Amino acid sequence: SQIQFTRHASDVLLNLNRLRSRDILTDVVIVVSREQFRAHKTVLMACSGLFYSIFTDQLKRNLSVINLDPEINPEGFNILLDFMYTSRLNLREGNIMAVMATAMYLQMEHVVDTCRKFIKAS
């Protein structure tokens, strides 16, 4: 019965990404080997089982730095972080295995499923 605004969610996500690009109200640094990426915990939680599980725990909720597994490919992580904030996933033959393994680690099941479909179509 409510009026539906079809573009609203995408508009919100766009603006959250704009805030990320200006480092406004970002509240965590994700360290992946020699690279670091800032983000909003709320978005990470919305998009990742790993981050949801980390930040829902009152023991870790207030952490401002998260060190990921050193084995994680920083580029794979970056691709997934960008996907979180844009809805667009950059899969290529050169990055498919790194992105897929990283998505497994981040517990992003729908993305893992999409990587499986990409492999199947390759």
Residue 88: phi and psi, rounded to 5, are -115, 125
Interaction residues for Cl ion, span 5-34 (CB under 5 A): 24-25
- In whole angstroms, give the CA distance from residue 89 to residue 41: 20
Q: Is 47 in the site for a second copy (CB under 8 A)?
A: yes
Rounded Cα gap, residues 119 and 7, in angstroms:
31
33 makes contact with ligand 7R5 (CB under 6 A): no
Q: What sign has the CA pseudo-torsion 110, 113, 115, 121?
A: negative
Task: For residue 59, state whether it binds a second copy (rule: CB under 8 A).
Answer: no
Interacting partner of 120 out of a second copy, ligand 7R5, Cl ion, none (Cβ under 5 to 8 A depending on kind)? none
Sign of CA dihedral 24, 40, 6, 99: positive
What one-letter code names the amino acid at 79? I
Task: Give me the residues that bind ligand 7R5 (CB under 6 A), please.
Answer: 15, 18-19, 45-49, 52-53, 107-110
Task: Give me the residues that bind a second copy (CB under 8 A), please.
Answer: 1-6, 8-13, 15-16, 19, 24-25, 27, 40-43, 45-47, 55-56, 61, 83-84, 87-91, 110, 114, 118
